[PDB]
Write a protein that binds this ligand. Sequence first.
Ligand code: HEM
Ligand code: OLC
Ligand code: OLC
Ligand code: OLC
Ligand code: OLC
Ligand code: OLC
Ligand code: OLC
Lengths: 157, 156
Amino acid sequence: MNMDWALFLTFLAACGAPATTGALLKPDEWYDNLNKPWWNPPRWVFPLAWTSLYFLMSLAAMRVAQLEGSGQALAFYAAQLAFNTLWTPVFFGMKRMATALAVVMVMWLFVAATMWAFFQLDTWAGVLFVPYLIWATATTGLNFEAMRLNWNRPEAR
Amino acid sequence: NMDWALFLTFLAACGAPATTGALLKPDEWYDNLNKPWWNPPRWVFPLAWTSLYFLMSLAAMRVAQLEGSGQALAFYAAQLAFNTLWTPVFFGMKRMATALAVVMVMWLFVAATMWAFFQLDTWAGVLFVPYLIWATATTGLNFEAMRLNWNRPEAR
Ligand code: HEM
Ligand SMILES: CCCCCCCC/C=C/CCCCCCCC(=O)OC[C@H](O)CO
Ligand SMILES: CCCCCCCC/C=C/CCCCCCCC(=O)OC[C@H](O)CO
Ligand SMILES: CCCCCCCC/C=C\CCCCCCCC(=O)OC[C@H](O)CO
Ligand SMILES: CCCCCCCC/C=C\CCCCCCCC(=O)OC[C@H](O)CO
Ligand SMILES: CCCCCCCC/C=C\CCCCCCCC(=O)OC[C@H](O)CO
Ligand SMILES: CCCCCCCC/C=C\CCCCCCCC(=O)OC[C@H](O)CO
């Protein structure tokens, strides 16, 4: 088990795809009109939190990818990253709050599945995913409260 | 050699890019764009991508059972993430220039995955060859969309 920079930089580069969805986000008047829960963090907190999580989840996957029998864990990891990339355009771009709740809940399950599978192979890789699952829980709560506290337009049938 | 837990996990992972196509079908903005002479008809794309998601998931299932597959699966996660990213950028945001960068990075990771798969399993690499071909055609379509519609602000 080493700091494998080829593995780490590949996983970090993979986090460039969800990072791009946040980068293409302009100040939205529709988002500032939404009634938010009192524990909603300010907008500037989210890019700082996600950058930390990209490094934590890339370091965790780097450790697991060096271990025998990691196939199922890395399959879960690919799944959570893909649905993570999907969520931001659905919520902010398409303004489809109901589908975004379904997307982030699927992301949550794959984040939980990755964390569990990581714990089976390496305790530190599982520990590194714990703040991710916590943040995914708060993100699911923010999506749920935003829909429950605001007007929602019908989406495409 | 079907590890059904592995294949269904990889197939479910492709539900994220498949969802982007379902929530963002090409509208009249896409039909108004100038197209390259070799532009395929609309029905080709759902047939191509559905086949590729099954092909790439079958390839990853074989590799994930093999000693030393960590780097190959890291490349696989990278190509899938940028695969999921492209449709919202091009069709949702209509940022054609940014979408070209996205699909070119995806192409590199698709090629890197194919190379890494060949190092572990010949059949897994073969299954990725039509993906790299289609990713090449996809990059050309993104490039031709910008070059044939440069008078549109969304192309620059
Ligand atoms: C990484 C690149 C791309 C990805 C991941 C992608 C993804 C998808 C998917 C999954 C579908 C099927 C959706 C469904 O069946 O419900 C689809 C449909 C389609 N896409 Fe793409 N695509 C890409 C590139 C392109 C490009 C470059 C173009 C055109 C320039 C394009 C135009 C279309 C069209 C025309 C359809 C079918 C429309 C219809 O069914 O009526 N796609 N895309
Ligand atoms: C054949 C042997 C293996 C060879 C392997 C070669 C392929 C590696 C390609 C890497 C491209 C790097 C892509 C980096 C993507 C980062 C995305 C980004 O830049 O995001 C920044 C943005 O500011 C935040 O939103
Ligand atoms: C031991 C200390 C370690 C420091 C590590 C580096 C610090 C990086 C920034 C963290 C901010 C996170 C907390 C953000 C909370 C913001 C809540 C808020 O609403 O801010 C209101 C304030 O008035 C705004 O102007
Ligand atoms: C209120 C919240 C504020 C939080 C603010 C604090 C932010 C700390 C971020 C990261 C800590 C560093 C974690 C470093 C983990 C490294 C794991 C690792 O690299 O292990 C692999 C090793 O290289 C193989 O031998
Ligand atoms: C083209 C898009 C198609 C989208 C639909 C694709 C099919 C999804 C099927 C089932 C959900 C996947 C569930 C994840 C796999 C569960 C099996 C598993 O993870 O096994 C656990 C392992 O054995 C413990 O060690
Ligand atoms: C276009 C249609 C898009 C379809 C959308 C995608 C479909 C996702 C379906 C099920 C996700 C299930 C989440 C994975 C939960 C796995 C839990 C599990 O199997 O636990 C195993 C154990 O934790 C490991 O050791
Ligand atoms: C526009 C640029 C087009 C570039 C087009 C090339 C892109 C991919 C590069 C090399 C593929 C070679 C991959 C296979 C490398 C050797 C594999 C091997 O060693 O064996 C394979 C098989 O298992 C038994 O021969």
